[PDB]
Design a protein around this ligand. Structure first.
Ligand SMILES: Nc1ncnc2c1ncn2[C@@H]1O[C@H](COP(=O)(O)OP(=O)(O)OP(=O)(O)O)[C@@H](O)[C@H]1O
Ligand SMILES: Nc1ncnc2c1ncn2[C@@H]1O[C@H](COP(=O)(O)OP(=O)(O)OP(=O)(O)O)[C@@H](O)[C@H]1O
Lengths: 372, 353, 57
């Protein structure tokens, strides 16, 4: 929505409090040593606003405590303060606050220091515009590549459940499943010869009218995520003409940019110099088509080179007006397009939070000042 | 042995009969995104008898310059490599294709599959070794999967995994033989030792090696590698856990392990499988993938003073502090035309002060 | 861009510096021809490659 600041107490690597400069308007960067705690911040956000890290049996959640410089702490605190500059929150609150304490068994919640439990926090989250079913824009480490090396199947499911109709293909085939082996029942009666024949017609009619809106709803986002994809890719690449195509049937991703000779191939049979582009492009297609309160990126600059950094930073510096984008960097080109800069250090088995200035960001992470 | 000259004909972004070389002990290469640099590694892997079934090719027809668009430059395209080592054998290997048919050549003569094997394991590399063959994101791939697949891949490397699919069907029926037989049991420990002395021999070796490998990468005492077997009598029947203790942490399972360290663990595992029957040359691409500049210098020094005894190294990298110190900076650059083409040019960082 | 800055051979470019910036400049020089901005080609195994600003400069 509009993130102000966070407070962390003993979550995974921060045994101390995390009162720092509030996060800026559009975009901020995170720099530091490998394993400093940058990713831990993002799992902290995901934990405080998603159940994927809080729905398991109560064994690993204890390892979701902080065990750096001493014994296990029985209680840890996570909270996030926002600023309702857009009147997004249904409740009339100027500074939106979410909070959870994790303990041996306690994982209750506090909205603006108000006692709230499980269901009465997801209800407001769904009224707050969040996709629990598929965690969009909390893309974690290794995402840009996991969707990349794999076939049309996982991109099909990625798009179709970021739309989200999982129950529909869980029961449509089950309705189909019984219609296959029961064909002998009709034919045996057909050999014997009654209402079931028009019933079989009724089966087809009801199934068709059921499927009418399901795939239509997919097209209610498919064509949107397709048209902007070509637009956003053309924005990224001056020759960019990557598109989506339709065929239950499959889909197809295709890419075209600056070649105009023979470079119309599918990214599955393509090398790694474009997979990250296709990923980021589809995330920005969702960005434009399906706006979200904020946007959280991890290692989105893992594979390509600085040539891609120049264009992506140039585009993001202007796309920041849509909403707040948050990512982690290790290089200064994309670091130069952030409203404020933040960093994570590590001392005595405990992470240390500190808002890094421009003069300290563009010299410490550029020149290798490693040790050990 | 040291590699000197490489000749390529009609591959992806490779039009022309370019000869490439010579090479050195630790040669680094850098270039733009999609510059055919990974296709160099593809050529190196293919010329040494690749499966030719997992290289963006249907069977043999999509492995040609502009092939999976419908415009192959020709029906034939091939590599030849010059392998020079001790014994005064400056020989050459060659992999050629015509149509959907492929052919092997040792010093320009007809060579078939099993003869290629009997001359290939002569070089010390198994037909199913594939140990040092890197990928663009190989070090981001092995860690994520469950330990059982790592056990399978580490048992298939010792001429052992090819009979697991028949060993597994042995046990569950022999209880009936127990229920009433003894001749089969007295012959049943034969296959048992065929598993044990064939797999555990390299297993203990790599388990010992990973310690000093991780040390050489980091020189941190608390940072320790631990390949912990479960039920060591039948370890490959289940998963074998791994614990790469970082310098600032303790013994922790694979569940809550930070991602930014899986790269170092994967590289250490690569050098560990190298320790088992090493290959005389290395290929590396995108070493600055997920490892930050903190450990990049340590890793780069580790290789470039680690590959000075019997095996050479080829590496692709991006971070500044690596090519602050390397000794070769060869490059491949793209160019337009009817399709994409690439051309090879050679500078060595040794001349660079 | 630093690649565009160099519009203002390469051994003299990368002579009086360590491998760091020398190789960075050489890498950018190789990159900027990705869409045919200069002309260059090495037929011989190991020597200098000469390029001058071309279609996009
Ligand atoms: N169970 C745990 N208890 C305490 N600390 C842990 C636990 N698991 C992981 N950590 C810490 O989390 C850190 C991860 O930090 P970070 O978020 O920077 O991840 P990274 O991907 O390794 O690094 P970077 O983002 O710099 O590339 C590790 O260095 C480790 O010390
Ligand atoms: N489907 C395909 N059909 C034909 N040629 C292809 C195909 N995909 C890729 N290629 C060729 O492979 C080249 C890929 O370049 P390259 O090998 O340098 O990439 P990479 O090293 O994997 O990428 P990165 O820049 O992410 O490291 C393309 O320029 C093209 O010549």
């Amino acid at each position: 929505m509009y993130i102000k600041q966070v407070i962390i107490q003993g979550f995974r690597s921060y045994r101390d409090q995390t009162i720092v400069d509030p996060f800026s308007s559009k975009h901020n960067v995170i720099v530091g040593r490998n394993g400093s705690g940058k990713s831990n911040f993002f799992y902290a956000i995901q934990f405080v606003l998603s159940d994927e890290f809080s729905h398991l049996r109560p064994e690993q959640r204890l390892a979701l405590l902080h065990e750096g410089t001493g014994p296990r702490v029985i209680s840890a605190f996570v909270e996030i303060i926002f600023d309702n500059s857009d009147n997004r929150l249904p409740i009339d609150k100027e500074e939106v606050s979410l909070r959870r304490v994790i303990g041996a068994k306690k994982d209750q919640y506090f909205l603006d220091k108000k006692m709230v439990t499980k269901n009465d926090v997801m209800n407001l989250l769904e009224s707050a515009g969040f996709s629990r079913s598929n965690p969009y824009y909390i893309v974690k480490q290794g995402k840009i590549n996991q969707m990349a090396t794999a076939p049309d199947s996982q991109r099909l499911k990625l798009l179709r459940e970021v739309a989200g109709t999982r129950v529909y293909d869980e029961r449509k085939e089950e309705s189909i499943s019984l219609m296959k082996e029961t064909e002998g029942k009709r034919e045996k009666i057909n050999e014997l010869l009654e209402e079931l024949d028009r019933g079989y017609k009724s089966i087809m009619e009801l199934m068709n009218v059921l499927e009418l809106r399901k795939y239509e709803a997919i097209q209610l986002t498919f064509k949107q995520v397709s048209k902007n994809f070509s637009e956003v890719f053309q924005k990224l690449v001056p020759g960019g003409k990557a598109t989506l195509v339709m065929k239950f049937t499959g889909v197809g991703i295709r890419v075209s940019f600056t070649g105009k000779q023979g470079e119309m191939r599918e990214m599955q049979q393509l090398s790694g110099g474009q997979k990250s582009l296709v990923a980021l492009a589809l995330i920005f297609a969702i960005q434009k088509c399906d706006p979200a309160p904020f946007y959280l990126f991890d290692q989105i600059d893992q594979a390509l080179d600085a040539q891609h950094r120049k264009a992506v930073s140039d585009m993001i510096m202007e796309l920041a007006v849509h909403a707040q984008f948050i990512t982690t960097t290790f290089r200064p080109e994309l670091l130069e397009s952030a409203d404020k800069f933040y960093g994570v250090k590590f001392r005595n088995k405990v992470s240390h939070i500190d808002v890094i200035t421009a003069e300290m960001a563009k010299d410490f992470v550029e020149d290798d000042t490693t040790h050990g | 042995g040291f590699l000197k000259l490489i000749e390529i004909e009609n591959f992806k972004s490779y039009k022309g009969r370019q000869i490439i070389g010579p090479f050195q002990r630790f040669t680094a290469i850098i270039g733009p995104n999609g510059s055919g640099k990974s296709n160099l590694m593809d050529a190196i892997s293919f010329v040494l008898g690749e499966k030719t079934s997992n290289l963006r090719v249907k069977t043999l027809r999509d492995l040609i310059h502009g092939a999976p668009v419908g415009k192959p430059a020709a029906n034939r395209a091939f590599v030849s490599m010059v392998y020079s080592e001790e014994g005064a054998e400056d020989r050459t290997f060659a992999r050629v294709i015509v149509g959907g048919s492929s052919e092997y050549k040792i010093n320009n003569k007809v060579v078939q599959l099993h003869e290629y094997s009997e001359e290939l394991e002569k070089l010390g590399i198994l037909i199913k070794a594939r140990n040092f063959l890197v990928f663009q994101g190989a070090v981001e791939s092995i860690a994520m999967k469950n330990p059982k697949e790592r056990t399978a891949l580490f048992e298939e490397i010792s001429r052992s995994g090819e009979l697991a699919q028949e060993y597994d069907k042995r046990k569950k029926e022999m209880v009936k033989a127990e229920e009433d037989a003894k001749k089969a049991k007295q012959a049943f420990e034969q296959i048992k030792k065929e598993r044990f002395d064939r797999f555990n021999a390299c297993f203990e070796s790599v388990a010992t090696n990973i310690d000093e490998i991780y040390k050489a990468l980091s020189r941190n005492s608390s940072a320790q590698a631990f390949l912990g077997p479960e039920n060591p009598e039948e370890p490959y029947l289940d998963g074998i856990n791994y614990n790469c203790v970082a310098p600032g942490k303790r013994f922790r399972p694979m569940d809550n392990l930070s991602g930014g360290e899986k790269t170092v663990a994967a590289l250490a595992l690569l050098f560990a499988i190298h320790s088992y029957k090493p290959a005389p040359f290395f290929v590396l691409d995108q070493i600055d993938a997920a490892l930050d500049n903190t450990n990049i210098g340590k890793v780069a020094n580790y290789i470039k003073e680690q590959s000075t005894c019997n095996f050479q190294a080829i590496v692709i990298s991006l971070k500044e502090e690596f090519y602050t110190k390397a000794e070769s900076l060869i490059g491949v650059y793209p160019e337009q035309g009817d399709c994409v083409i690439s051309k090879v040019l050679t500078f060595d960082l040794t001349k660079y002060p | 861009k630093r690649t565009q800055q160099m519009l203002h051979s390469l051994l003299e470019l990368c002579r009086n510096t360590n491998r760091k910036q020398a190789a960075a400049k050489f890498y950018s020089f190789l990159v900027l021809k990705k869409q045919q901005a200069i002309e260059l080609t090495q037929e011989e195994p190991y020597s200098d490659i000469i390029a001058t600003p071309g279609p996009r400069f």
